[PDB]
Structure formats: C-alpha cells, structure tokens
C-alpha cells in the first residue's frame, strides 16, 4: 500500500490504452489506482462523468445484471477479483491490461442507425463515438460471459476470464468479438 497504490494487488502504472481516441474513457489511473472495484460513486448526475469511473469498476457494475443480480456489487467485486487472478494465471501480464485490451478491441468502430428511409426503411452507416465504444464493449463482454456461464458448470469469473482473454487478443472465439464484427459489418453495407 504505501509504495505504490496497487490493485487488489495489481499495478496501475505501466498499463497503456493501446488505442488512440479510446484513451481516456478507459479510466485506469493517469493516476487513479485504487484498491477495490467498489466506490460510493456518483457518476449519474452529469452526462460525461461516467468516464471518470475506473473501467474496472465499470466492468464490475455491468456484471451485476439480471433482475436477481441487481445490487449485488459485493458479488461482482468478488467475481472481478477472481477473474483478474485467472487471467493472470493464463498469461501473466496485467489482467487489468488484459481487461483494457478486450475493451479497446470490442467497441464497434462503425455502426448502423435505423434511418427513416420511406417505406422500406433502410439503415445508415454512421461512425460511433468513443463513449459508446467503451459502453458497448463492456456490455458485450459481460453479456458474453453471463450468457456462456448460465447452463455450464463454469463460473462467471472463469467465463469472464475466457471472454476477456479471447478478446484481449481478438480470438473471435468470443461472443463479444463476433457480435462487434456483426454490428460493424452491418454498418458498412447500408452505406
């Protein structure tokens, strides 16, 4: 704790958002290292503020989904802490770096909007903001991990690690990666 403010026990320093633009709604800690993916957190009042929120916590929040799981942050924090450990065993590294990478890789660059189009409503290829890219990515990965975990013996921490790792280097094994490519493919036509 006093030397450097590590994560559960992981270093914030030396993790670099390998992707210009995204830089910065992915919030590691260009100084902000903490200890735990839990905070009082008031993000809601402002439109932007959410970006400030540590990406780790942001990921943890998205974890607690589905009516029953709402509000179970302690459970998510527990899952997140485990996932980072599994990821680390799987590739060394900073699992936090692994997390960041998956996020950078998953945000749909291009997308589609349902432009009115007269009749046979066609869809217009539009580029996607970086806030959306981050927001969307974290969903994709969480929905990915949650969906996989449900009928299988494997635990969310594990499924999360699997989704995160495959995404970190976009294996396309991942549900999320396949989804992102689908959303983008759609963006390109339409145009």
């Amino acid at each position: 704790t006093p030397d450097i403010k590590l994560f559960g026990k992981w270093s914030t320093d030396d993790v670099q958002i390998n992707d210009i633009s995204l830089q910065d709604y992915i919030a590691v800690k260009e100084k902000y290292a903490k200890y735990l993916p839990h905070s009082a957190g008031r993000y809601a009042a402002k439109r932007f503020r959410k970006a400030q929120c540590p990406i780790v916590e942001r990921l943890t929040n998205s974890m607690m989904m589905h009516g029953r799981n709402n509000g179970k942050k302690l459970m998510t924090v527990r899952i997140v802490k485990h996932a980072f450990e599994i990821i680390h065993l799987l590739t060394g590294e900073n699992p936090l770096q692994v997390l960041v990478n998956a996020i950078i890789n998953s945000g749909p660059r291009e997308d589609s909007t349902r432009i009115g189009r007269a009749g046979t409503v066609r869809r217009q290829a539009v580029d996607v903001s970086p806030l959306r890219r981050v927001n969307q990515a974290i969903w994709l990965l969480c929905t990915g991990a949650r969906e996989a975990a449900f009928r299988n013996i494997k635990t969310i921490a594990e499924c999360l690690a699997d989704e995160l790792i495959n995404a970190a280097k976009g294996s396309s094994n991942s549900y999320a990666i396949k989804k992102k490519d689908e959303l983008e493919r759609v963006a390109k036509s339409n145009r």
Binding site: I20, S21, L22, D24, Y25, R47, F48, R109, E110, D111, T113, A125, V126, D127, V128, S129, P130, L131, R132, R133, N135, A187, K188, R191
Partner: peptide
C-alpha cells in the same frame, strides 16, 4: 462534418470508414 451514435464531447476521437 460527421454524424454520431454515442455521447461525444470535444477532443475525443472518431474512426471514420467512409
């Protein structure tokens, strides 16, 4: 001039296809 899906604020970056 480009149109956006997400929430966008000055200084952040788009990845243009077209």
């Amino acid at each position: 001039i480009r149109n956006v899906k997400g929430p966008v604020r000055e200084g952040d970056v788009l990845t243009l296809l077209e």
